[PDB]
């Protein structure tokens, strides 16, 4: 609605190919692709196609996705995670983040195609990529290994988290 009725300005060094519903934004950082919903019509302006009930809702999604595809190729996305807890280290080797998270085994998260990662500190992971959905998924997967506990905040958190703690009862 309001989101769909608000066009995506493509900047310089970006190119688009509308093969029906299929779209391919491509710039410096990479080449992203999406097949849009059949109810959406793109031109970047997004609008509902007639003979579909949920046209405006579907348009507003398609808008938001192609806006992130634009940020994908121009700027790229960055997600930062930090490892709170004694002995909790991290390190990268090619496309494999090796975490020590207080387990008896080593955790070695294989990164997907687009995403790279860097550990500026032992207690920080800074993954980067074009696809906003994919960085989000990698970050969630890393967080899942040792989610922040509510007593001392120990675990993998997003840098951005307010990790509510609580006291361990009276007595």
Q: Which residues bind RNA (CB under 7 A)?
A: 1-5, 37, 54, 56-61, 63-65, 68, 132-134, 136-137, 140-141, 144, 149-151, 166, 168-169
CB of 108 to RNA, least distance (A): 15
Determine contact, residues 42/62, Cβ cutoff 8 Å. Answer: yes
CB of 75 to RNA, least distance (A): 14
In the complex with RNA, the residue whose CB is nearer, 91 or 144, is 144
CA distances from 166 to 15, 20, 62, 150 (A): 51, 54, 41, 6
Residue 111 is given by DSSP the state P
In the complex with RNA, the residue whose CB is nearer, 122 or 156, is 156
In the complex with RNA, the residue whose CB is nearer, 70 or 90, is 70
**How far is Cα 23 from Cα 6, in angstroms, rounded to an integer?**
18
CB of 122 to RNA, least distance (A): 24
Structural tokens at position 5: 């009725």
**How far is Cα 65 from Cα 69, in angstroms, rounded to an integer?**
6
Residue 119 is given by DSSP the state -
In the complex with RNA, the residue whose CB is nearer, 96 or 140, is 140
CB of 36 to RNA, least distance (A): 8
């Amino acid at each position: 609605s309001r989101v769909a009725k608000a066009p995506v300005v493509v900047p310089a060094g970006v190119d688009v190919k509308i093969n029906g519903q299929v779209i391919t934004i491509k710039g410096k950082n990479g080449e992203l692709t999406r097949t849009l919903n059949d109810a959406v019509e793109v031109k970047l302006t997004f609008g509902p196609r007639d003979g579909y009930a949920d046209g405006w809702a579907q348009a507003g999604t398609a808008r938001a996705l192609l806006n992130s595809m634009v940020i994908g190729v121009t700027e790229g996305f960055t997600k930062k995670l930090q490892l709170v807890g004694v002995g909790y280290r991290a390190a990268v080797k090619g496309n494999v983040i090796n975490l020590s998270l207080g387990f008896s085994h080593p955790v070695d998260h294989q990164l997907p195609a687009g995403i790279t990662a860097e550990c500026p500190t032992q207690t920080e992971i800074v993954l980067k990529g074009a696809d906003k959905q994919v960085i989000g998924q990698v970050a969630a997967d890393l967080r899942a290994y040792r989610r922040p506990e509510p007593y001392k905040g120990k675990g993998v958190r997003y840098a951005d988290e307010v990790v509510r703690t609580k006291e361990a009862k009276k007595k």
